[PDB]
Write a protein that binds this ligand. Structure first.
Ligand SMILES: *[C@@H]1O[C@H](CO)[C@@H](O[C@@H]2O[C@H](CO)[C@@H](O)[C@H](O)[C@H]2NC(C)=O)[C@H](O)[C@H]1NC(C)=O
Ligand SMILES: *[C@@H]1O[C@H](CO)[C@@H](O[C@@H]2O[C@H](CO)[C@@H](O)[C@H](O)[C@H]2NC(C)=O)[C@H](O)[C@H]1NC(C)=O
Ligand SMILES: *[C@@H]1O[C@H](CO)[C@@H](O)[C@H](O)[C@H]1NC(C)=O
Ligand SMILES: *[C@@H]1O[C@H](CO)[C@@H](O)[C@H](O)[C@H]1NC(C)=O
Ligand SMILES: *[C@@H]1O[C@H](CO)[C@@H](O)[C@H](O)[C@H]1NC(C)=O
Ligand SMILES: *[C@@H]1O[C@H](CO)[C@@H](O)[C@H](O)[C@H]1NC(C)=O
Ligand SMILES: *[C@@H]1O[C@H](CO)[C@@H](O)[C@H](O)[C@H]1NC(C)=O
Ligand SMILES: *[C@@H]1O[C@H](CO)[C@@H](O)[C@H](O)[C@H]1NC(C)=O
Ligand SMILES: *[C@@H]1O[C@H](CO)[C@@H](O)[C@H](O)[C@H]1NC(C)=O
Lengths: 248, 50, 361, 120, 50, 49
């Protein structure tokens, strides 16, 4: 069951600076009071990231190419974002991922679904509206895990497809700025690795009212960073070796 | 594969020992100069300029 | 010293001859807890099994399979593998496991194998010639058979062409024995394709039903979510042992550490990018791994024309880990330490010298 | 600890012997350097208890009896301002011994001029 | 093939850097001698014979 | 300019860094030599006319 929306007011997506966010732990290795340099898919500091808005009319749910790595930031309050869509063609011809977070727990499924052109949810002020797919033919992997969850809460996410391992990184950050991204440093820890081993090149983020929601999309690129580990082992600062000559 | 690792690590070790020998030659020249300064400036008064 | 200098006469001095190495004593392996067991209880001892023409394919993935328990069960009258080794099942890894469960006669068990020609192989269930895995069969007289005849299980008897590998056929199209047309109505030379089995307890060996489950492995580019079990031994600390922690193997002395790992972190590295701490998979504690106390062995000797007495220095080695005196250079054995001071004769290091007068340090 | 790697390494001859020999030569040469710089006098001289040097003040270069290492203030400042099969061999002369040698040189050049460098 | 070329060219480069370091040590000794001559013969009168 | 060769060369570690560092040391050493030979006076003197 899908439904077309036509009450949107057409508006091009905005772009905004990345500042000094997007640094994640490249491995499970503890380090203390040392400077470590590694070559891994990293988001260059101070780049334009795509900005998607949802406010009332805006409800931006486009479908974007994955390339080799994607950065998700979400200045999210009251949990309007409930899932994600990952795959190649997003139909029953091919095999895609279903990564969702409903009112009980998070479900990770690798099945041949039939996604709607307009996948969306709805909350009555209690949620009883599930319009995200129409069929589910062949599953190949099901996984249940612990739940991941003025804008107050910030969610950071990095996704990669390296040798069949789907690495997800995350951080919860307390923010108090209303409109755009804050300025500061935040290291992302690895939360879960998915041994999916499938091709993925395209993805989608998951009258009526459009709740106050916003999120950002950035892209990962192969380069070299210089990461600072403190005594307790947390990445406090990082240096992009190819940003500007001083950092180099 | 172990022979490849052995020749690589052996080349690294020989490079390290060679540069250690060169640095040791430089340090030995500096120490001979320091001994000469000790003898001629500390144990005596030197007429040599600078 | 004579062997190292390649001479029978050795002049006075100190010579580095050997390299001390604290040999490992135990071999310690710790692997995480064996959780998420595969649902083998709903497969191999389920209530009812499927028919041979409509075999249920059960897929096993995202779990650890303990093949020891199944392999040590003696109720399986036929445990034959065709592409792998039964004694290696608990170590090798596979992407997924497909279980093909069906019921046939006690004599038709052999036909579920490559290179076999028969009714079951051609019209009911076919395996490829490059099949890998195991075919497991066990007697099911006391479960499937009934006094009045178990007619629930059907099998395909006549088909126009041989079966392709892992192909099902759930259609009930009427077979044409001869050349006369048949539009689905039985006639003189047109019979039903599926036949019911005549399972009765009174028959001897040869007619009893056998529940047969066939496991086939896949080696696709996806990660091998199905692996064998892991056997973790006990932990011995504060000794030079062989440790292998989740694929990280080496030698060292394991002690308690006051460093605080973040919960996701497993390994730890120093400035020189060498492993120094690892988190134990069984118990969430951090063990500092210091290297086993190696050192260069030096032999202190006067001239062989003077005496044959020698003193031994273990450079940078604590005396408790090897006339036994502890210097800042290392552990010096064979030289009696005196409280008086002389001119240096044989240099040891850190202000200590050795001389022959007995060898004094 | 790999036995097969060592078995292969025996086919390479005495490269390890060469490297150990060269490093041992460097190690003994460092001690020889320190001997030739500092161990130039065989008499250990001490400064007199009364520091009456005609108004000249050597307190910054003479050893401090309060310190446990018996280093001079300038020496203590210098020491404060300068910060897998591999072993670090300690030097033959400790920092205390080098400080004593320097103290003997200072005491000789203060109480005796250049005469202690050419004899009694 | 590229590994063969890489090890050969890396050996050649290491050899070149090794004699460069040795000749640099020799030239540094000569320059230290020249500085000593400048100090003791140009900036003063030397009693050192020859 | 080959990227495959450079990728294979990266697996040899830091040999290139050592060689570049040694050559840079020699290069600055030459300038230090010239300074220590010739720049012995910070005072520029001129002969009288
Ligand atoms: C919402 O709109 C989209 C875009 O017009 C619809 O997607 C098309 O659906 C028709 C079937 O009616 C297909 O023939 C087209 O190929 C679809 N377009 C694309 C790009 O795939 C979608 O079906 C609409 N939703 C509903 C419920 O009708
Ligand atoms: C020699 O010099 C030292 C330091 O230059 C003098 O020590 C100072 O003494 C005065 C008064 O006695 C103190 O207020 C200073 O704090 C001392 N300085 C230090 C660094 O401790 C010393 O008096 C001088 N004269 C003699 C004879 O030793
Ligand atoms: C990002 O893109 C927009 C338009 O595509 C451009 O105006 C902006 O300057 C870009 N950002 C940077 C940092 O160049
Ligand atoms: C959430 O999704 C799971 C998976 O289908 C389902 O079992 C559960 O009932 C759902 N909960 C709610 C509240 O919709
Ligand atoms: C995938 O689903 C389709 C339709 O549901 C089915 O025809 C096909 O056999 C399925 N593939 C497999 C491998 O079972
Ligand atoms: C994945 O699919 C895309 C098409 O969306 C294709 O360009 C790419 O080559 C595929 N990659 C693999 C590894 O199959
Ligand atoms: C490391 O954690 C401890 C927790 O007791 C804290 O006291 C200390 O300040 C932390 N280190 C830094 C650099 O913040
Ligand atoms: C049937 O097989 C399952 C396999 O998981 C096993 O747990 C169970 O004990 C078996 N039943 C009997 C009666 O042994
Ligand atoms: C694993 O088992 C050990 C021993 O029972 C227990 O201490 C530990 O909490 C278990 N879980 C994990 C995640 O290590």
């Amino acid at each position: 069951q899908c439904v077309n929306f036509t009450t949107r007011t057409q508006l091009p997506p905005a772009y905004t600076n990345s500042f000094t966010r997007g640094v994640y732990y490249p491995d499970k290795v503890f380090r203390s009071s040392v400077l470590h340099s590694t070559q891994d898919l990293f988001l260059p500091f101070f780049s334009n990231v795509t900005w998607f808005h949802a406010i009332h009319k805006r409800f931006a749910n486009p479908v974007l190419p994955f390339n080799d790595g994607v950065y998700f930031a979400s200045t999210e309050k009251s949990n309007i974002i409930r899932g994600w869509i990952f795959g190649t063609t997003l139909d029953s011809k091919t095999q895609s991922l279903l990564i969702v977070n409903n009112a009980t727990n998070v479900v990770i499924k690798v099945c041949e679904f039939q996604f709607c052109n307009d996948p969306f949810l709805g909350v009555y002020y209690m949620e009883s509206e599930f319009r995200v797919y129409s069929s589910a033919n062949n599953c190949t992997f099901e996984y249940v895990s612990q739940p991941f969850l003025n804008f107050k809460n910030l969610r950071e996410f990095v996704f990669k497809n390296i040798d069949g391992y789907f690495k997800i990184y995350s951080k919860h950050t307390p923010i108090n700025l209303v409109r755009g991204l804050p300025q500061g440093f935040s290291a992302l820890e690895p939360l879960v690795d998915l041994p999916i081993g499938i091709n993925i090149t395209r993805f989608q983020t998951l009258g009526w009212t459009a709740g106050a929601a916003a999120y950002y999309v950035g892209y990962l690129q192969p380069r070299t960073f210089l990461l600072k580990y403190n005594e307790n082992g947390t990445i406090t600062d990082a240096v992009d070796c190819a940003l500007d000559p001083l950092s180099e | 594969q172990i022979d490849r690792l052995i020749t690589g690590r052996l080349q690294s070790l020989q490079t390290y020992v060679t540069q250690q020998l060169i640095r040791a030659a430089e340090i030995r020249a500096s120490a001979n100069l320091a001994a000469t300064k000790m003898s001629e400036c500390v144990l005596g008064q030197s007429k040599r300029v600078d | 010293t004579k062997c190292t200098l390649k001479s029978f006469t050795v002049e006075k001095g100190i010579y580095q001859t050997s390299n001390f190495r604290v040999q490992p004593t135990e071999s310690i392996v710790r692997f995480p807890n064996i959780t998420n067991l595969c649902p083998f209880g709903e497969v191999f001892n389920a209530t009812r099994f499927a028919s041979v023409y409509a075999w249920n394919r059960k897929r096993i993935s995202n779990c650890v399979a303990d093949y020891s328990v199944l392999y040590n069960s003696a109720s399986f009258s036929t445990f034959k593998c065709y592409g792998v080794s039964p004694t290696k099942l608990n170590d090798l890894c596979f992407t997924n496991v497909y279980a093909d469960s069906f019921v046939i006669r006690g004599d038709e068990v052999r036909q579920i194998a490559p290179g076999q020609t028969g009714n079951i192989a051609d019209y009911n269930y076919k395996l490829p010639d490059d099949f890998t895995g195991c075919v497991i069969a066990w007697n099911s007289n006391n479960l499937d058979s009934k006094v009045g005849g178990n007619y629930n299980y059907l099998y395909r008897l006549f088909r126009k062409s041989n079966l392709k590998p892992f192909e099902r056929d759930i259609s009930t199209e009427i077979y044409q024995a001869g050349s006369t047309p048949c539009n689905g109505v039985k006639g003189f030379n047109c019979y039903f394709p599926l036949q019911s089995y005549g399972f009765q307890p009174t028959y001897g060996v040869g007619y009893q039903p056998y529940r047969v489950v066939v496991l086939s492995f896949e080696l696709l580019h996806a990660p091998a979510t199905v692996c064998g079990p892991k056997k973790s031994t006990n932990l011995v600390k504060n000794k030079c042992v062989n440790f292998n922690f989740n694929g990280l193997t080496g030698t060292g002395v394991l002690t308690e550490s006051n460093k605080k790992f973040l919960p996701f972190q497993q390994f730890g590295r120093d400035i020189a990018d060498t492993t120094d701490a690892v988190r134990d998979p069984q118990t969430l504690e951090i063990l500092d791994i210091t290297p086993c106390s190696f050192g260069g062995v030096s032999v202190i000797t006067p001239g062989t024309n003077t005496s044959n007495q020698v003193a031994v220095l273990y450079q940078g080695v604590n005396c408790t880990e090897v006339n036994v005196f502890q210097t800042r250079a290392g552990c010096l054995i064979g030289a009696e330490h005196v409280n008086n001071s002389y001119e240096c004769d044989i240099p040891i290091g850190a202000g200590i010298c050795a001389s022959y007068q007995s060898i004094i340090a | 600890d790999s036995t097969e790697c060592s078995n292969l390494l025996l086919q390479y001859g005495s490269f390890c012997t060469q490297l150990n020999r060269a490093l041992t030569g460097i190690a003994v040469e460092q001690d020889k350097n320190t001997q030739e710089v500092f161990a130039q006098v065989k008499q250990i001289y001490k400064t007199p208890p009364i520091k009456d040097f005609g108004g000249f003040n050597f307190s910054q270069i003479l050893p401090d009896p309060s310190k446990p290492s018996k280093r001079s203030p300038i020496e203590d400042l210098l020491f404060n301002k300068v910060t897998n099969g591999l072993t670090v061999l300690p030097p033959l002369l400790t920092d205390e011994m080098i400080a004593q040698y320097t103290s003997a040189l200072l005491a000789g050049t203060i109480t005796s001029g250049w005469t202690f460098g050419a004899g009694p």
